[PDB]
Each structure stands twice: as structure tokens, then as C-alpha cells.
């Protein structure tokens, strides 16, 4: 509903001279919407749950969540010298938070010869995803259309390589930037919506 198939075809010239069918066109669209709005900073992949032991990092305790929860659901932390669990609301966009140095409890077990009383590590649980929001500001649609146009006639057996550096790469190798959406003109149209 956001990007019509007829609009994609009329942009990429696939009109009465039809390349790979609508099945591959919609697959290319589903992959262009995992390339764009994942490059600029948006996100996808709806509801999913991660249990993850969290490791102490820093004197004041930087905590890096390896799955960047949704925007504000309280990630609950427990264990690891922490006798009673505590929630923490994260800042959206990033996964760096701080373990509050004010500790609520320390349920240590001084003295034991069955486990040598080292520790049970800190653990946490959270969710990632989004219910549904897919957004495509007019102006960042041109990069997606250009990526589709490029991927229609660049199946992957034709040699294309633009140079990034000027001298050489290291060896007798033909430079290299062979990515797509950059030899297609999409990165430099999505940069306008990137901090």
C-alpha cells in the first residue's frame, strides 16, 4: 500500500518489456525495505523475546543490550550479587544504559566448598520488535526505487566495481565497492535523513 507495484515498474522502466516477475519484484521490495530504513536508523522485525546474561562493563556500569529493546519497555535485571530484581527503562534508538551504582542488595554466600562461592552472574530479560509502523517519507523513496531498478538488471554474474580509494587496493585486484544502493544512488539520497 505504501509502494505500488505499478509505480515500481514505471520507475524502473519494466513496462511492456517485463523482467523477472512480480514474485521477485515483491521480494526485492521486501529486501529494499530491510536495506532502507535500516540504513538510516529505523527498525523492524516485530515481537521477539531475549533472555540474556548481562556482564558488568565499567566502574559505573555501562550495560550494552545486544538486542536494543523496543523503545521504553522496562528490561528487568536480576542475579549477580543482586538479591531482588530491578527494572530499567531504556532510551530509544540506542542500547547503552547504566547499572545504577546504588545497589539494592547483595545476597552473597561467604564460605562454601561445593561451588567455592564465586557468583551466579547477572541476568536480564527483555523484548525487541515493533507492533507495526512502516514509514517511508516522500523523498526517501527514490533510493528504494533506484535499488530495485539496479537489482532488476544486476542479477549477480555481471562484473561491476566502482573505486573508493585512488591508489590501488593492495594487490592486482580490481579495486572494489560492489555493494548496491551506492552504485545505485540510494545511499546519497538516504543520507539526507541521517544524522
Amino acid at each position: 500500500t505504501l509502494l505500488p507495484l505499478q509505480t515500481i515498474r514505471e520507475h524502473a522502466k519494466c513496462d511492456d518489456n517485463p523482467r523477472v516477475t512480480d514474485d521477485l519484484l515483491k521480494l526485492y521490495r521486501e529486501a529494499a525495505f530491510e536495506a532502507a530504513e535500516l540504513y538510516t536508523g529505523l527498525s523492524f522485525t516485530p515481537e521477539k523475546t531475549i533472555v540474556e546474561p548481562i556482564r558488568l562493563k565499567g566502574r559505573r556500569g555501562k550495560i550494552i543490550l545486544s538486542a536494543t529493546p523496543i523503545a521504553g519497555r522496562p528490561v528487568v535485571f536480576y542475579g549477580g550479587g543482586l538479591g531482588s530484581p530491578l527494572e530499567l527503562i531504556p532510551r530509544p534508538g540506542s542500547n547503552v544504559l547504566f547499572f545504577p551504582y546504588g545497589s539494592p542488595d547483595r545476597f552473597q554466600t561467604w564460605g562454601d566448598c561445593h561451588t567455592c562461592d564465586v557468583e551466579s552472574q547477572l541476568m536480564a530479560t527483555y523484548v525487541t520488535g515493533r507492533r507495526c509502523e512502516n514509514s517511508v517519507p516522500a523523498g526517501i523513496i527514490i533510493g528504494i526505487l533506484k535499488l530495485i531498478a539496479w537489482n532488476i538488471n544486476n542479477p549477480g554474474d555481471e562484473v561491476m566495481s566502482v573505486r573508493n580509494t585512488l591508489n590501488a587496493n593492495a594487490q592486482g585486484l580490481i579495486g572494489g565497492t560492489n555493494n548496491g544502493a551506492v552504485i545505485s544512488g540510494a545511499q546519497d539520497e538516504w543520507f539526507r535523513y541521517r544524522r
Partner: peptide
């Protein structure tokens, strides 16, 4: 011919 030239269904 590169396999992208074949753009007609016959």
C-alpha cells in the same frame, strides 16, 4: 550476452 539482456517472455 549478460543474462539481464533476456528481458522478454516468449
Amino acid at each position: 550476452m549478460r543474462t539481464a539482456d533476456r528481458k522478454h517472455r516468449v
